[PDB]
Structure formats: C-alpha cells, structure tokens
C-alpha cells in the first residue's frame, strides 16, 4: 500500500516515474511480491489461469459472433473457391469515399475485411454450415467464459482455496490431464467427427435437434460390440465425391485411406476420426500409469531416483530431480514452453504439407499467414523456455540437493558445451555465408556455371524412402521389392503414394541446391540462438567476471565499468540478445517458405531453383519483385484494397527503426537532457502552476533495452505480416 | 435486509465508487429518476412530433457530403433524418448536463457526493408520503418513471412493436 | 444490427479509453491505498 504498486514497498517509495514503469513490469512476478507465501502464490497462479482461459474463450466467441453477424459464411460454403471469406465490417469515420468503395468486397453492402485466419475452412470442415450454428457456438463459448470467470473467483474463497499439497499432487494431475484432458477430449472430438462432421460432409444435416435419432452408421454399434469393426471401414467415399453433398458419398466412419480428398485436396474426415479415436485410446491407457490412492501405479520419485547407470558416466543419475521439478515453477514452466514451441513448429510444418481443412491450400494467403504465425509463436515459446530455465538456475536451483546430479553435471562441463556450440555456429556461418557470397560473385561476373551447387542428397533420400519416385533412388517405399512397401501396400500405401508423387501438393516439395543452402542457414540460426540462450542459462549463476552473479538476481543492468566493463552481463541480457537471433532465424525460415510457395503457385518453380543460390537473387526476385503490389497500395493515382497493408508496412518499418533509438543510445544522455527539460518547465510562467507529481527520469537501462527490443519485434512482425499478406493477396501468389 | 446486504456488498467491493456516490446509492437513484422523468416527457413529445410530422420523417436521409462520414451507417446507407433530429434534441440536454455537472449552481444538488458529506439515508420500499415539491415526491415519481420505461421497453421487445408504437397503444391511442 | 457499430465504436475507442485512463491516473497517484 501507500502508493500504486502494493506488491513492492521499494517501488512504492520511489518518487520518480520509474515507480509507474516497474509497477507494470513486476505485476505478474508473484514470487517477488512482498509478504508472498508458497500457498498464496499457487492459488493466485490458479486464479490467473482461470482468467486466461476465460479470455481465450471470449476471443473465440468474438470470432464466431463476428463471422456469423457480419461474415458471408453461407455464401462462402456455397462457393468456397471464388468468394473471399469476411472477417468483420470496417466502421472507420476517418475513411474517405474512395476508401469505402475500395474496401467493399465479398458480399458487399458495407466495408469489410477479408479474413486470412482460415477459420472459414476449419468451421466448414468440422461440419458447420449456417450462421445460426456459428451464433450458437459463440453463445456457448460466452457462457463457458462466464463460468470460468466464476470458477476463478470461487477458488479464491477461503473455504474453496485448494491446499498446497493439492497443487503438488503430480501423479493425479498427470493421470487426469493425460487420460481426461487429452484422451477423453480426443474421444469426444472423434465422436463429434463421426456424428456431425462426416454426415455434414455427406450432405446430411445433423444438429442438436436430430442427432439422438439418426445413428452415424446404419449398423449402429452392433459391429462395435460384436467385434466386426471392419464394418466401419467398408464403403468409403469414392474419389468422385463432392464434399458437402451426397454425390458419390459413402458410409464408412473409420478408414485408413491416406492421401487427400480429391475434390477438397485435404485429409479424409474418416481418416481424422480414426486418428483421433486411436489417439484417445492411447492417451486413456497412458493416463493409468501413476498411482493415485488406488495401490496400483508408478511413483515418479522412485523412477527418477532409480535411473542412474552403473557405469557412472552420468554420476548420480537423475537423483533429486523430482524435488527440483516439483518445487520449482520456473523449471516446469520452461519445460512446458519448450514442448509447446516444438509442437507449434510441428503444426506449422505439417498443416502446410498435410492439408487438414477442406478447400485450404487454394487460399494461399491463409496458408502463408498460418505458417508464419505459428512459426513466430514457436520461436517466442522456445526463447521463453530458455529464459525461464535461466530464471530457474538463478533462483530455484539448489546445488546441495543436486550433488553429482545430471543437472549439476550440466553446469560442471558448461565450458565444453558453450565452446563446441560456438564452434558449430562459427563453422556453419563461415561456410554458408562463404558459399552464398561465392555464388553471388561468380554470377555477378557472368559465370553462373562456376557456382557451388550442392545437391541435398540426404533430404532427397528421405523423400524417396517415403515413396518419392522422382530422384531414382529405389530405396524402401520407392522400390517395389522391399518389405516396407509390401507390408504397407494393403492399408495406406496406395493413397499416400498417389499423394506424394503428385506434384500438385505440398507433400515433400522437390528440393535442390537452394533448399540445401537455406537449410544450412536455418541450422546456423538455430545453433546460434541456442548458443546464446544456453550460455545465458549456464552462466546465470556466475562467471569469472561475476563469480557471484546469482546474488544480483536474474535481471540487473550491469556490474559497473570496473574490471573491463560488464554491459549486458546478466542472464536477462542473454535472453534479450537471443531474441534478435530468434527473430532473424524465424525470418529466414518464413522467407524460405514464402518464396518457395510463391514460385510454385505462380507456376514457375524454376525461378527459385535458379535464384536461391545467391543472395542478390533473394534481394531481387523475392523482396524487390513481390513488394510491387504492396507499395502500390496507395499512389497519387488512387488507392485499392491493399492500402491498409501498405500503411501497416510503413508503420512496421517506423516501429522497427524506433527500436534502434532505445537499443543504440543509452540512458546517461537522456537523463542529462531531461534535467534541462525539468529546468525549462520549472522556469516558465503560466506553466509553473501545473507541476508533475512523479519526478520525470530517463528509462532505466534494463527497461530501455526491453522497450527497444519490444519496438524492434513489433515493427519486425508488423512489416513482415503486411508483406506476406499483401504480396500474396495482390498477385494471388 | 436483502437490499441492505447487496448495498453493503457493493460498498465492500468498490469503496471508492460507493463513497463518491457511483453505484447503488440514493443520489444515483434520484439522478436516474429525474432523467427518466424527463425521458418520459421527451418520448411523449417524440410521439407527438412523429404524429404531426414535425420530425423530417424517415423518407429523407442525410447527405453524405454535407454531414461527412459520421452520417454513414454501414456503407452507402446514411442515418435517417428523424434519428438525427432526436439525437440532436438529446444533444441539447447532454450539453446542458455537462455544463451543470462541472459547474453546478450553488443551491443545486451536486452530481457526486461532496468529499466531506455522505449519501443520504435510504428511502425504503414505500418512501415517506408527502405531497408538493418535496424530495420524497420527486424520488417516488422518479422510481415510477424508471419502472415504466423498463416495462414499456419490455413490452416493445417481447411483442416486437416499436417502443413509440407501444407507447401509442397505451394512453388512449392519442399519439403515434 | 447495422446501427450498433456507430454507437459502440466511439464508446470503445474514445469514451472507454478516456474514462479508463482517467481512473488509472487517479489511482496511480492516489497516494493512499
């Protein structure tokens, strides 16, 4: 109390504007709040999670409501290839008449934004057909969010607040969140697909008013109990099936066709249903592994303690990891963030190659937006995982409880890890940049025949192993006389091979020297970002320059100019530096994906194969060439629908540049300037009446680095989003 | 009582707003009642004007060029002149409201409770019955007017008829 | 429907932020609780 931030007496007593700024940046760091205990920490985290779930569900309900109320979902489902999905109306009083006329598209009769989220395709695939269904879903989600908000309030009452032992009941949590949250949820989703999505795709309207009397399969659970499950695979949808209608429709609900639906160029709904049924079964079985007051099950502490190889190469093995993980929220938060980042990358990599949604992969802008979105989120999640691991080392690691432990041995040979990571990064960077510059130079001198074009033999070999009969390797599924192909020949090999060998797909795009060089650049980026983050995490507890770094916390500005200078020595500074590399590598990945897909869509993939071997090709044939429809969003001759994207492009450039202001110029100059500003204000008549209550000071060093990084990131993301959306939507590629 | 318990719960939840008078307080009740009384007067006047066509009628929609893009509803459509006229009849009172809210007449009742003072005692289910220009009469009439607005709006929404037409249905069908 | 955006967008972009910033400014520098 006594001022704005209650959770910090030190900040509360601060007389400057700093009190405000830090008051915002320390709010969610519950550990540091004054008079904070473990139990209250856990309960506050629980309530905050309830609130976050409510926010997510309200966001989803808003999307559904806006599409239902202002979208053209019915028109789109009628003709989903030619019309453009609508996001929401544009009521902007700042628009001029030509702008209103220009942004009127799709259904028209009002200014409107064309949705690039792909939610239309997803909702159409899952069986929704009318605005009424979207509205009902949104109302249900609003009610669910209200329920979650009430639950969050309720679990803060003294008689309903769960005890501390309840939170640390790892076994029961794992059991329920595996069998229940993952498995039963997947079982329910496959039930939906069988009961709603598939019948809706076959022209039959199933809804809440009739889903209890129309069984999804004519036999109706008789084969299931009798054991004749094959019945559910018989009579699949023939290739001449018009999605959403009974023309060429089948009756199977669980098949393993593989490949893609010819009309929608997406996965078969029955394949998804069978997939999710199998996943639900596996997760439900997995959730019965740990004991919860029922005698049977595993005790995880014993498991961790028992895995110490007798060879002694791991020292004490995993002894003491159970206590560190259960007692430290930062370690488990980092683990969860890392796994989520890997999964986000996996979704980005798999949705584009294996299209799950009907009529997607023809809405190019949506695919590009989704891929870029999920890759950037994956990068953010990975950086966060490593940052929270550094935090764990700073304030949660107990070297006495991890003596000779695997985790302790990680710090024991940290020098080797960091040095070999540095060697790999230097090797990759040196040589990849050298090859790129060599190609640039030879092509510049009109001698393209001298380029070092390296064929990605290993990636092409992998593609052949899956059935890519284009490189002539004759290995595994690419050779008929192989155990793999014959064993799989009956179930899914025909459809999968038909899909992979067809060049009208994203399944295993053909690759060449350009793909090789870009993949090595990506490896460089990943290795360098990992080097930065791992160095920060391992040196978080101290270095030769600061052997007592752990005593100064996770985020401190420096240790003064003494003994050589110690700018950016804290682990938080390692995260701040690694954020730039994360952005750079994700940008490389997204540039590679977008350019390859743009060239494929245009119908001249040779352009990429030719111009991706030297950097001038990237600068000319990708950035310079594809930005023409973007920068022409508004010219003195007029404007078109892309004007907003061009404006956002320039805006992102401006924010990116503004970030340099905080990243280059540091505090002392600005503090000395604010001194003169204060003097000037205090010595002005008619303005001496108005006096600040908080003394105005320059931003702190760490705050300034954070703000510069935030501007850098916001500008980066906005400009690249504008480019990727506008180019694709302007050239339809 | 239940009302007293709800008021105490609000006071505990949001002490600052309750202290200033915001929320379930007798000052707010009086202000809303006065506004609702004037609102009933204004709805009667709007009905009469619609009957006699004093309002420019929905046949005419404001021109985009003269009234700018604020007049724009959705895209090509523009706010009807009748809606604009009613909005301006309301804007007069809103300007008055700001003037009297930040610069109240010394004898006038302030919008918010003075810092030193505290809200007046609760009236109760049946406010003390005294005729003439007395506070109790004003509060009773304000409660009646607000309840009337609520239930006539409920009628219009449930039946689907316009609020003005529902008002017309009442009385003796004098208005429209 | 087709009338709400006119009513709400000004409230959400002007009135709501204005009142929110007023209240936050009052609370940040309240100097008590």
């Amino acid at each position: 109390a006594t001022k704005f931030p209650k959770f910090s007496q030190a900040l509360a007593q601060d007389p400057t504007t700093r009190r405000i700024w830090f008051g915002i940046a320390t709010a969610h760091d519950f550990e540091t709040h004054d008079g904070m205990t473990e139990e209250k920490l856990y309960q506050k985290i629980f309530a905050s999670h309830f609130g976050h779930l409510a926010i997510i569900f309200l966001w989803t309900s808003g999307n559904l409501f806006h599409v239902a109320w202002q979208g053209n979902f019915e028109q789109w489902v009628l003709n989903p290839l030619k019309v453009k999905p609508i996001a929401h109306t544009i009521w902007d009083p700042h628009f001029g008449e030509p702008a209103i006329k220009a942004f009127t598209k799709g259904g028209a009769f009002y200014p409107v934004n064309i949705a690039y989220s792909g939610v239309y395709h997803w909702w159409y695939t899952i069986g929704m057909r009318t605005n009424n269904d979207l509205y009902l879903g949104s109302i249900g989600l609003i009610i669910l969010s209200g329920l979650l908000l009430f639950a969050g309030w309720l679990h803060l009452q003294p008689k309903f607040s769960p005890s501390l032992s309840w939170f640390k009941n790892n076994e029961s949590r794992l059991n329920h969140h595996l069998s229940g949250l993952f498995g039963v949820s997947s079982l329910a989703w496959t039930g939906h697909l069988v009961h709603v999505a598939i019948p809706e795709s076959r022209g039959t309207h199933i809804g809440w008013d009739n889903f209890l009397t129309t069984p999804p399969h004519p036999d109706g659970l008789a084969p299931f109990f009798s054991g004749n499950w094959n019945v559910y695979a018989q009579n699949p949808d023939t290739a001449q099936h018009i999605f959403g209608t009974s023309q060429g429709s089948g009756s199977a609900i669980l098949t393993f066709l593989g490949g893609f639906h010819p009309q929608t160029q997406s996965l078969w709904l029955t394949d998804m249903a069978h997939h999710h049924l199998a996943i639900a079964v596996i997760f439900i079985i997995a959730g019965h592994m740990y004991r919860t007051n029922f005698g049977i099950g595993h005790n995880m502490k014993e498991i961790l303690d028992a895995h110490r190889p007798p060879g002694g190469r791991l020292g004490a093995g995993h002894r003491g990891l159970f206590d560190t993980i259960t007692n430290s929220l930062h370690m488990q938060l980092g683990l969860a963030l890392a796994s989520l980042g890997v999964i986000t990358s996996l979704t980005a990599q798999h949705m584009y190659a294996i299209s799950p949604y009907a009529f997607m992969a023809k809405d190019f802008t949506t695919q590009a937006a989704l891929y870029t979105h999920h890759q950037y989120i994956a990068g953010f999640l990975m950086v966060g995982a490593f940052a929270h691991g550094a935090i764990f080392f700073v304030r949660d690691y107990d070297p006495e409880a991890n003596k000779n432990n695997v985790l302790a041995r990680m710090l024991e040979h940290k020098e080797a890890i960091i040095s070999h990571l540095s060697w790999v990064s230097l090797f990759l960077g040196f040589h990849t940049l050298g090859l790129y510059i060599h190609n640039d130079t030879v092509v510049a001198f009109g001698q393209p025949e001298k380029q070092i074009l390296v064929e990605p033999v290993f990636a092409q070999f992998i593609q052949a192993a899956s059935g890519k009969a284009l490189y002539g390797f004759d290995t595994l599924l690419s050779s008929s006389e192989s155990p793999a192909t014959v064993a799989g020949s009956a179930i899914w090999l025909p459809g999968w091979l038909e899909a992979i060998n067809s060049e009208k797909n994203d399944l295993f795009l053909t690759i060449g020297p350009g793909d090789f060089l870009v993949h090595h650049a990506i490896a460089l980026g990943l290795h360098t970002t990992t080097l930065i983050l791992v160095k920060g995490a391992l040196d978080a507890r101290g270095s030769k320059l600061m052997p007592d770094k752990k005593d100064f916390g996770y985020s401190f500005p420096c240790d003064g100019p003494g003994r050589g200078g110690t700018c950016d020595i804290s682990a938080w500074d390692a995260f701040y530096l690694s954020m730039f590399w994360m952005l750079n590598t994700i940008g490389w990945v997204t540039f590679y994906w977008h350019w390859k897909h743009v060239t494929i869509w245009q119908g001249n993939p040779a352009q990429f194969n030719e111009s991706s071997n030297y950097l001038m090709g990237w600068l000319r044939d990708y950035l310079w060439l594809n930005s023409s429809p973007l920068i022409n969003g508004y010219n003195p001759y007029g404007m078109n629908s892309l004007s907003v994207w061009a404006w956002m492009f320039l805006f992102g450039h401006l924010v990116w540049a503004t970030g340099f202001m905080f990243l280059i110029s540091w505090r002392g100059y600005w503090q000395e300037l604010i001194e003169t500003l204060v003097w000037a204000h205090e010595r002005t008549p008619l303005a001496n009446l108005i006096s600040w209550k908080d003394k105005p000071v320059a931003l702190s060093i760490v705050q300034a680095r954070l703000v510069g990084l935030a501007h850098f990131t916001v500008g980066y993301i906005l400009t690249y989003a504008a480019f990727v959306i506008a180019s694709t939507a302007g050239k339809f590629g | 009582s239940v009302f007293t318990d709800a008021t105490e719960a609000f006071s505990k939840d949001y002490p600052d707003f309750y202290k200033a008078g915001w929320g379930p307080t007798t000052k707010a009740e009086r202000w809303n009642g006065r506004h609702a009384m004037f609102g009933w007067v204004l709805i009667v006047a709007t009905g009469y004007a619609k009957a006699h066509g004093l309002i420019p009628d929905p046949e005419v929609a404001l021109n985009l060029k003269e009234w700018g893009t604020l007049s724009i509803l959705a895209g090509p459509q523009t706010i009807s002149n009748e809606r604009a006229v009613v909005l301006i009849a309301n804007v007069h009172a809103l300007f008055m409201s700001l003037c009297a809210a930040f610069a109240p007449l010394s004898f006038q009742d302030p919008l918010l409770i003075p810092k030193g003072q505290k809200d007046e005692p609760a009236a109760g289910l049946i406010p003390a019955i005294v005729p003439g220009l007395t506070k109790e009469a004003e509060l009773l009439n304000g409660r009646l007017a607000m309840l009337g607005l609520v239930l006539v709006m409920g009628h219009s929404l449930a039946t689907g008829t316009p609020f003005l037409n529902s008002v017309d249905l009442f009385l003796g069908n004098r208005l429209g | 429907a087709s009338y709400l955006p006119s009513i709400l967008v000004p409230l959400v972009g002007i009135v709501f932020p204005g009142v929110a910033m007023a209240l936050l400014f009052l609370y940040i520098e309240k100097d008590d609780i």
Partner: peptide, 30 residues
C-alpha cells in the same frame, strides 16, 4: 442473418460475463 434479438441476448450474456470478470479481478486483490 442473426436477428436483433440474437445480438441483444449475446450482448446481455457478454455483460454478465463482464461483471463476473470485474468480480474475479477484484478478488485477485492487488
């Protein structure tokens, strides 16, 4: 094709949820 009644009841349920959010936040108790 959502009618005005549907929008209105959506707004009412949103208002209820907003009030619940107000109360939950208040209870997080700064």
């Amino acid at each position: 094709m959502v009618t005005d009644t549907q929008v209105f009841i959506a707004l009412v349920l949103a208002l209820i949820s907003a009030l619940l959010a107000i109360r939950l936040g208040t209870k997080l108790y700064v």
